[PDB]
């Protein structure tokens, strides 16, 4: 395994509270209000998916074991523009449909000083261009469930000075804040949709713990040290490691894993399976004896 680690296997294509089954009946009480994951016929309520039965008040629903991430109103998400059309962008978030943006839902350079122009709707590509990453908040929701985004804040906007990585959205939950400062002078942006942005800590992040013309520039910080770059790589690998073990990603978990991973000299050692599994396992056991 000096150059490549090749795991082999022969003769096989691959290797290796009430129970719920399809055609199963959950209840026969007609008083219940049937929610998602269910369907009914008179008194009988059946399950439409494979998951666990959920009872909140009078609302019976079945929570699926798997599925697409769902946008709730007020979520902090990170998305990459998919398309530019008309007076809006459609930004990939990672859901069933592309995110929706309205030219009136973004903030122009120079701001309040700036005067309204009818040329903005024809020059949207100078602000958001296909492929660009950005912070955004789910402002509203459409009838089908699609999300309308907005970046009307200094906290939100185009992303730079870092690298992108993604984990299953189930491993990232809602919180008071999703932007966090970590040791090594780097900052993480944990989108609820599972899209994660790791960048060099800016002044904005520092201020929170305590230029309006260049908020859409593709240019990065001309002075980014190798120590920050090698920190980003390490934070990236440990996040992927937490994701590999189905471990919920939290700011505490990330920093804990980052310092625990210091055992391994080379950062590239964190990509191996046994290393990832142990790092995640060490975090769970650490929370065991600390809790």
């Amino acid at each position: 395994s000096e150059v490549i680690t090749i795991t082999k296997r022969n003769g096989a294509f691959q290797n290796s509270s009430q129970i719920v089954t399809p055609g199963e009946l959950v209840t026969d009480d007609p008083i219940w209000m049937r929610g998602h994951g269910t369907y009914f016929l008179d008194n009988m309520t059946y399950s439409s998916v494979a998951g666990t039965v959920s009872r909140v008040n009078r609302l019976l629903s079945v929570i699926p074991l798997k599925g697409r991430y769902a946008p709730e109103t007020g979520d902090h998400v990170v998305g990459r523009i998919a398309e530019v059309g008309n007076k809006r962008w459609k930004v990939d978030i990672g859901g069933k449909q592309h995110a929706v943006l309205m030219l009136g839902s973004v903030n122009l350079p120079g701001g309040i000083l700036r005067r309204k122009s009818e040329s903005d709707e024809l020059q949207m590509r100078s602000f958001l261009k296909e492929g660009d990453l950005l912070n955004a908040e789910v402002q509203s929701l459409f009838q089908d469930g699609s999300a309308s985004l907005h970046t009307r804040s200094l906290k939100y906007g185009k992303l730079r000075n870092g690298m992108f990585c993604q984990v299953p959205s189930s491993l990232i939950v809602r919180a008071k804040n999703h932007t966090h400062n970590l040791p090594g002078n780097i900052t993480v942006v944990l989108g609820v949709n599972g899209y994660i942005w790791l960048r060099k800590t800016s002044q904005m992040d520092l201020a929170r713990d305590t230029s309006s013309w260049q908020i859409y520039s593709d240019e990065n910080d001309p002075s980014i040290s190798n120590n920050i770059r090698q920190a980003i790589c390490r934070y990236a690998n440990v996040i992927k490691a937490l994701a590999f073990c189905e471990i919920g990603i939290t700011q505490q978990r990330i920093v804990s894993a980052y310092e625990a991973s210091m055992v391994y000299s080379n950062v590239g050692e964190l990509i191996e399976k046994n290393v990832m599994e142990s790092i995640g396992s060490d975090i769970l056991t650490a929370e065991k004896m600390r809790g």
Partner: protein
């Protein structure tokens, strides 16, 4: 004289900056890229270097355009019948000859054929009209004429097949350019009776087009010679 008169694509012409000694003072010549030239980077012996390099096979022409003096020289390459003219592209303020493709109620979309040059001469954009590769443009109902901008009957202004000389206010989106025929020298130039079925018609009044052959008169938006 220092730089070759004619340069093939890939031939070095002149470095980034230049200077000379005259009248007991240093005159700074600032070399800037132009049509046919491209500023690129070349490194020799581990040394980085930027110099103006021609990208088209042509004779080379320079022209000045704007205590201690100050200067600016424009370096370009001109080829030297068939004409290609790619550098030419519809930009805000330019005049463009278009042809009406379809008529709607609130607007009128066309396609760009040729673009007027600067001091008449024109630059013909060669494209297939039976594909859709030709640049498309849209003339708004408010951009038809300065007189009564609110209510304008588009049927009595343009017509499918009629040639319209207009000026592009803005690029718009990838689909439609913005076209205005508000001024006097803009409007329907060449047109025929009955969507092209009849004879040729000429422009008399600004809002009236007549045909001195069959005596037919159709309402158009005409320009001024």
């Amino acid at each position: 004289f220092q730089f070759p008169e004619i340069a093939y694509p890939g031939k070095l012409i002149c470095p980034q900056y230049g200077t000379e000694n005259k009248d007991g003072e240093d005159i700074i010549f600032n070399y800037v890229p132009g049509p046919g030239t491209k500023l690129i980077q070349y490194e020799h012996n581990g040394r980085t270097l930027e110099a103006i390099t021609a990208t088209l096979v042509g004779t080379v022409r320079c022209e000045e355009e704007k205590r201690r003096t100050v200067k600016n020289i424009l370096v370009s390459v001109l080829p030297g019948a068939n004409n290609d003219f790619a550098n030419n592209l519809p930009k805000e303020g330019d005049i463009v000859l278009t042809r009406v493709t379809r008529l709607s109620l609130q607007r009128a979309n066309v396609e760009i054929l040729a673009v007027e040059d600067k001091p008449a001469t024109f630059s013909v954009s060669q494209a297939s009209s039976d594909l859709g590769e030709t640049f498309r443009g849209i003339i708004r109902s408010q951009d038809v004429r300065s007189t009564d901008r609110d209510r304008v009957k588009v049927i009595e202004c343009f017509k499918p097949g009629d040639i319209v000389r207009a000026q592009v206010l803005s690029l718009g989106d990838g689909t439609n350019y913005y076209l205005t025929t508000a001024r006097n020298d803009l409007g329907v130039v060449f047109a025929r009776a009955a969507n092209g079925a009849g004879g040729l018609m000429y422009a008399t009044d600004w809002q009236m087009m007549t045909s001195p052959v069959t005596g037919a008169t159709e309402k158009r938006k005409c320009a001024k010679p």
